[PDB]
Amino acid sequence: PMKGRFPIRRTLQYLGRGDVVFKESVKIMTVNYNTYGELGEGARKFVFFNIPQIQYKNPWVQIMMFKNMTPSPFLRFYLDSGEQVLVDVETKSNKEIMEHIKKILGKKEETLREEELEKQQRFHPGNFGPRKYCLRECMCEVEGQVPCPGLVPLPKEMTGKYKAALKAST
Amino acid sequence: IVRSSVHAKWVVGKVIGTAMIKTAKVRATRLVLDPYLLKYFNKRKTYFAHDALQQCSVGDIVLLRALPVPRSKHVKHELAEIIFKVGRVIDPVTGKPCAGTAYLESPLSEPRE
Amino acid sequence: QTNYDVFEKTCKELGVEYTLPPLHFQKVHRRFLAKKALCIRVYQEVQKLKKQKRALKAAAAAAKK
Amino acid sequence: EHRELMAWNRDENRRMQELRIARLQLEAQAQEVQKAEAQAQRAQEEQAWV
Amino acid sequence: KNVLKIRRRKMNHHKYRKLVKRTRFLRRKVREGRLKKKQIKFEKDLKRIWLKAGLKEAPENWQTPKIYLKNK
Amino acid sequence: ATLNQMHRLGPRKEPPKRLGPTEGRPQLKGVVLRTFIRKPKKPNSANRKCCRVRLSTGKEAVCFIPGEGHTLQEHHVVLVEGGRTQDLPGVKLKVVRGKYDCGHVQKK
RNA sequence: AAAGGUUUGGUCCUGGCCUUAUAAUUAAUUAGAGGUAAAAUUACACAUGCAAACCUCCAUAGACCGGUGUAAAAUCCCUUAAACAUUUACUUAAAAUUUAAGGAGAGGGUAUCAAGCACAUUAAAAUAGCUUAAGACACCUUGCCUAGCCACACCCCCACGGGACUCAGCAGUGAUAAAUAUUAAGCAAUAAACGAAAGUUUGACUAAGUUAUACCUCUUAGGGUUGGUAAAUUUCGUGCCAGCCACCGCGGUCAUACGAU
RNA sequence: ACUAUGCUUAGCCAUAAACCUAAAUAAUUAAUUAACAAAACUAUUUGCCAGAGAACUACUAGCCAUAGCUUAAAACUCAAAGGAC
Numbered sequence: 057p058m059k060g061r062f063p064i065r066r067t068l069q070y071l072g073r074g075d076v077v078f079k080e081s082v083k084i085m086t087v088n089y090n091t092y093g094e095l096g097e098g099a100r101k102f103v104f105f106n107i108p109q110i111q112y113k114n115p116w117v118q119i120m121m122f123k124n125m126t127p128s129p130f131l132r133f134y135l136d137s138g139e140q141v142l143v144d145v146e147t148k149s150n151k152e153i154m155e156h157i158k159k160i161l162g163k164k165e166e167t168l169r170e171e172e173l174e175k176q177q178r179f180h181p182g183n184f185g186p187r188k189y190c191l192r193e194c195m196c197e198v199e200g201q202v203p204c205p206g207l208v209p210l211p212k213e214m215t216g217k218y219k220a221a222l223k224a225s226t
Numbered sequence: 227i228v229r230s231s232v233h234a235k236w237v238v239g240k241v242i243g244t245a246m247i248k249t250a251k252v253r254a255t256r257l258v259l260d261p262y263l264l265k266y267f268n269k270r271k272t273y274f275a276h277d278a279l280q281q282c283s284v285g286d287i288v289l290l291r292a293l294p295v296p297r298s299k300h301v302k303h304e305l306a307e308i309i310f311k312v313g314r315v316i317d318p319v320t321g322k323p324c325a326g327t328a329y330l331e332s333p334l335s336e337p338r339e
Numbered sequence: 340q341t342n343y344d345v346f347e348k349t350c351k352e353l354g355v356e357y358t359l360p361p362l363h364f365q366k367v368h369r370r371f372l373a374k375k376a377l378c379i380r381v382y383q384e385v386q387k388l389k390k391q392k393r394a395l396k397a398a399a400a401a402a403k404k
Numbered sequence: 405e406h407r408e409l410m411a412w413n414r415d416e417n418r419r420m421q422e423l424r425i426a427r428l429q430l431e432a433q434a435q436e437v438q439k440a441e442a443q444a445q446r447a448q449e450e451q452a453w454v
Numbered sequence: 455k456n457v458l459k460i461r462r463r464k465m466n467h468h469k470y471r472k473l474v475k476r477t478r479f480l481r482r483k484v485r486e487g488r489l490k491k492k493q494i495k496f497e498k499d500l501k502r503i504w505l506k507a508g509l510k511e512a513p514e515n516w517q518t519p520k521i522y523l524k525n526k
Numbered sequence: 527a528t529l530n531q532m533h534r535l536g537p538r539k540e541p542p543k544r545l546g547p548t549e550g551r552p553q554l555k556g557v558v559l560r561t562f563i564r565k566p567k568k569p570n571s572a573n574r575k576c577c578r579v580r581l582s583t584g585k586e587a588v589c590f591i592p593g594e595g596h597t598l599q600e601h602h603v604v605l606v607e608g609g610r611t612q613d614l615p616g617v618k619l620k621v622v623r624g625k626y627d628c629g630h631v632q633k634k
Numbered sequence: 635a636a637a638g639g640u641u642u643g644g645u646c647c648u649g650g651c652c653u654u655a656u657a658a659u660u661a662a663u664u665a666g667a668g669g670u671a672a673a674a675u676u677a678c679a680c681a682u683g684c685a686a687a688c689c690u691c692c693a694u695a696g697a698c699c700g701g702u703g704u705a706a707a708a709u710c711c712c713u714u715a716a717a718c719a720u721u722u723a724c725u726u727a728a729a730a731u732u733u734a735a736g737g738a739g740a741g742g743g744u745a746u747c748a749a750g751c752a753c754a755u756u757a758a759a760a761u762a763g764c765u766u767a768a769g770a771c772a773c774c775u776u777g778c779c780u781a782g783c784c785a786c787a788c789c790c791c792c793a794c795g796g797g798a799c800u801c802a803g804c805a806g807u808g809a810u811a812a813a814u815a816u817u818a819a820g821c822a823a824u825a826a827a828c829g830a831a832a833g834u835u836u837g838a839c840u841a842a843g844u845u846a847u848a849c850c851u852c853u854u855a856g857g858g859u860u861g862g863u864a865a866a867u868u869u870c871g872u873g874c875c876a877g878c879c880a881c882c883g884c885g886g887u888c889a890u891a892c893g894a895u
Numbered sequence: 896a897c898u899a900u901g902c903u904u905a906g907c908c909a910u911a912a913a914c915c916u917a918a919a920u921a922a923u924u925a926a927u928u929a930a931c932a933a934a935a936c937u938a939u940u941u942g943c944c945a946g947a948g949a950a951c952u953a954c955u956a957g958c959c960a961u962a963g964c965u966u967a968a969a970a971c972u973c974a975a976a977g978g979a980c
């Protein structure tokens with residue numbers, strides 16, 4: 057049995073379910089939540105369930121969490137321009153908090169798709185090379201082309217050993 | 227007005243020391259994923275920050291701005307803001323003084339003092 | 340950490356001095372306390388020599404000017 | 405689009421601030437009533453104790 | 455449970471105590487010499503520090519304390 | 527251990543693999559120094575043929591000579607290999623029959 | 635791991651060791667040809683030959699290719715600036731290739747290495763600080779990041795200087811080691827250097843030589859094993875001896891366990 | 896028979912089968928018998944363990960401790976040791 061409560065939170069599939077990819081402006085997200093109370097239950101669940109998913113998709117964003125410092129829970133984002141975006145998450149479900157932050161400071165699906173395509177621009181199927189980078193190492197693998205001499209012996213007339221013998225014979 | 231090279235253009239941390247002149251030692255923490263356990267833990271870093279007015283006290287949360295030119299070997303940030311003062315917090319949501327999870331001044335009232 | 344204003348009055352009235360917890364624990368034993376005393380003394384001597392050298396160097400320059 | 409989203413956020417914070425003042429107002433009325441009753445019990449007990 | 459594992463430790467400790475009893479005087483001379491070497495290593499380590507710092511004589515009014523001798 | 531304790535310690539520390547009589551090498555060449563007999567610890571009974579050798583590394587080891595009958599003598603050269611003789615305690619090397627001075631057992 | 639064998643008079647539990655799978659090197663025995671890949675004891679000392687030229691004088695090149703894994707926890711990934719011993723363009727901009735200062739995060743061992751001893755800040759030159767059990771410092775070990783990268787180039791970390799005075803370029807030799815490729819041909823191909831060019835040069839490379847180390851196609855058959863784990867023994871000899879076993883174990887006269895068959 | 900000693904006044908030493916062999920805290924008593932013991936079992940946090948012997952040992956550092964305490968290996972040996980029945 058995996059240790060801890062809700063061990064599914066410690067699986068790569070769960071971490072990849074996060075959908076909030078912050079814009080490049082977002083630099084820090086401080087989370088102020090209270091460990092005791094009734095109006096801060098959603099914030100506590102947001103720290104428990106959602107903060108891992110947010111960090112997984114935003115490795116360069118500093119998430120620092122403070123406990124029992126204020127009467128109510130809130131989220132404050134620090135942007136590169138110097139703006140500070142305060143969010144009030146009291147009486148809000150953990151799912152509601154995720155949707156709110158996605159709207160205001162989350163990249164759109166169109167933007168994310170474009171980046172994925174650009175990343176793969178330099179991979180070409182026709183390119184030959186090692187398996188890590190290319191589909192086929194050599195043209196011998198292609199159908200109809202002369203096969204590799206190791207797998208299939210070449211005709212004698214196509215061999216330097218044979219050609220050199222003829223030149224001596226000439 | 228080119229910006230710093232350092233990755234940490236904006237860092238939040240706690241002032242863990244203030245015994246250097248016009249400098250505040252700040253401990254920042256980030257979340258790092260343990261690859262074996264797939265759980266996040268806290269990796270903490272120390273940042274020297276220029277406290278021009280010596281307005282920082284141990285235990286207060288602060289925001290640092292990366293300096294364009296390193297002031298010294300270790301001082302590469304300045305104190306942008308004091309997010310939370312130690313024991314003197316002001317609620318961001320309501321704006322009233324607080325002492326923990328309680329209001330020193332009720333939000334219903336309008337003291338304007 | 341919660342009410343700094345109340346904290347300041349209580350310490351002044353009750354006459355209680357509050358020292359903040361030291362970040363790092365320092366071990367103590369005869370060998371360490373003796374080496375740590377010399378190291379502090381050696382530094383001070385080196386710095387005292389530098390101050391004397393700076394004064395002599397500046398004094399010579401002033402005479403030349 | 406950033407400016408519009410930052411305007412919507414401030415409105416949401418004001419909308420929730422309004423609810424907080426409405427909720428906390430109700431508490432002041434009820435808690436005030438309880439405080440008066442509790443002070444009455446103290447007055448009765450305090451006189452008896454004297 | 456039986457006391458068999460305790461009996462092994464019982465014999466090990468008894469035999470060790472009699473071995474220490476036999477060679478008690480030899481052990482004393484070993485210790486006084488191990489402490490003397492422990493002091494010289496302490497003194498030398500202090501000389502290394504000031505010599506590296508650039509001092510040619512130990513700091514004024516300094517005498518390495520003798521911390522391993524019978525001072526108490 | 528808790529997840530915090532597993533994180534602070536990480537994977538189990540692994541004692542290093544100390545080498546054996548051959549020093550992690552397939553074979554060694556040695557010069558015979560003496561030929562003697564060793565008695566197999568009880569409950570076995572035999573007069574096992576062994577020899578001391580100075581290996582190329584420079585150390586000296588005791589090597590069991592397998593087979594029925596050997597012609598080894600002092601100053602001979604042999605190729606030793608690994609493999610302990612279970613009954614003979616301390617004998618962690620064996621001689622290879624058919625290499626250098628040592629020869630194959632004469633078949634009967 | 636789909637597991638198995640082995641604690642005991644016996645059972646259960648716990649627990650180590652070992653077996654079964656895969657691959658490299660060396661060794662024993664054995665071996666036809668053909669194709670292909672790889673070639674590897676040693677930063678110990680090196681006989682001999684060769685490995686850098688081109689070219690109307692100036693220049694350019696010999697800073698590459700090739701070799702080794704010396705040193706070093708050495709690094710990876712990323713940011714910023716700058717040049718270039720460059721190219722191609724313009725009289726001003728696109729690249730390739732480097733250098734310097736850095737840091738979100740990641741990065742070997744020993745904590746019986748627990749303290750380091752100046753490792754800080756301010757900028758009237760004062761303050762007493764800086765790193766460290768969230769592992770500093772010390773010591774030890776190792777090339778890693780693998781379309782490749784990093785370091786090294788006889789030794790003294792460097793190379794003014796000094797010394798024990800140069801194959802870690804190809805081939806080859808001595809010594810050393812369990813470890814064994816030709817002191818070979820060609821510049822025709824591709825790559826590099828030079829030239830305006832026809833061209834020239836190249837132990838890079840290409841085509842061969844050597845070798846069951848691997849793979850492929852074939853044709854001869856040899857090696858080991860046969861108590862259990864674990865597929866498979868007849869007769870005889872031996873008699874706790876001679877010998878055998880990876881583990882448990884076998885051998886004291888009807889031994890499926892040793893030797894021959 | 897008799898002493899050190901048990902007692903008192905100060906200081907030192909810092910060890911026990913110091914074991915109720917069961918860390919502390921908050922639960923739960925059904926969805927729940929390896930054996931034995933004092934029923935099972937979840938969460939939180941720290942400490943500790945990784946075959947037996949060698950070893951309450953060697954070396955190191957600290958300590959009023961000097962035949963001492965805490966800290967604590969390796970070589971080497973074995974194919975088991977151990978717990979309950």
Ligand code: FES
Binds near residue numbers: 194197
């Ligand atoms: S690998 Fe393509 S010809 Fe051999």
Ligand SMILES: [K+]
Binds near residue numbers: 569
């Ligand atoms: K026997």
Ligand SMILES: [K+]
């Ligand atoms: K087992």
Ligand SMILES: [K+]
Binds near residue numbers: 786
């Ligand atoms: K060098």
Ligand SMILES: [K+]
Binds near residue numbers: 821
């Ligand atoms: K050519």
Ligand SMILES: [K+]
């Ligand atoms: K056969």
Ligand SMILES: [K+]
Binds near residue numbers: 912914
């Ligand atoms: K007890």
Ligand SMILES: [Mg+2]
């Ligand atoms: Mg009993």
Ligand SMILES: [Mg+2]
Binds near residue numbers: 462465466
């Ligand atoms: Mg004993």
Ligand SMILES: [Mg+2]
Binds near residue numbers: 641642
């Ligand atoms: Mg038993």
Ligand SMILES: [Mg+2]
């Ligand atoms: Mg061979």
Ligand SMILES: [Mg+2]
């Ligand atoms: Mg190269």
Ligand SMILES: [Mg+2]
């Ligand atoms: Mg090395």
Ligand SMILES: [Mg+2]
Binds near residue numbers: 746
């Ligand atoms: Mg030690």
Ligand SMILES: [Mg+2]
């Ligand atoms: Mg040489």
Ligand SMILES: [Mg+2]
């Ligand atoms: Mg050099």
